Amino acid sequence: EFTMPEHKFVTLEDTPLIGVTQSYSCSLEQISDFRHEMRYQFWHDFLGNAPTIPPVLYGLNETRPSQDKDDEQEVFYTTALAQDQADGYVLTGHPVMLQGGEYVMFTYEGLGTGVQEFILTVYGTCMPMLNLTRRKGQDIERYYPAEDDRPINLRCELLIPIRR
């Protein structure tokens, strides 16, 4: 009695983003803990000098095949900010560019431990009933961190680039 998650097809435009990038290397059982490790790192260092809370926060998975050998693939997840209707922003980082275009947006409503199952539910039991194909691009994690002692009921969104 599996219940399918809510999904939607979105066309996206270019948004100039700024933030901090770094490489990492770990198994993907802790791809949910480490992506929330760096997102705790940059959202609890932007707010600590910010006057204003933005409505959105972006996390961008990028992948770099190292020119030496395609056996290890350098991965880039980056907690980065977007433009809003606020003027005064104190931030650190260099301008990154969202590789926009065609995207598929999964939408989540539930617990903080199920954010792992929002990232665990990727490769096995669901989507080839639609028979999708992923183009080159960046995977995006879309959060809403202003609205969150029980484990929290946060509203998160993935984003996969799918060519049709």
């Binding site: 998650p5 770990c26 198994s27 993907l28 059982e29 791809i31 990232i119 665990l120 539910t121 990727v122 490769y123 096995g124 039991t125 669901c126 989507m127």
Partner: peptide, 14 residues
């Protein structure tokens, strides 16, 4: 959905 978890464990467990 589910067998995502096989992908980078196999990066760690060959």
């Amino acid at each position: 959905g589910i067998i995502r978890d096989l992908l980078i464990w196999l990066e760690g467990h060959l």
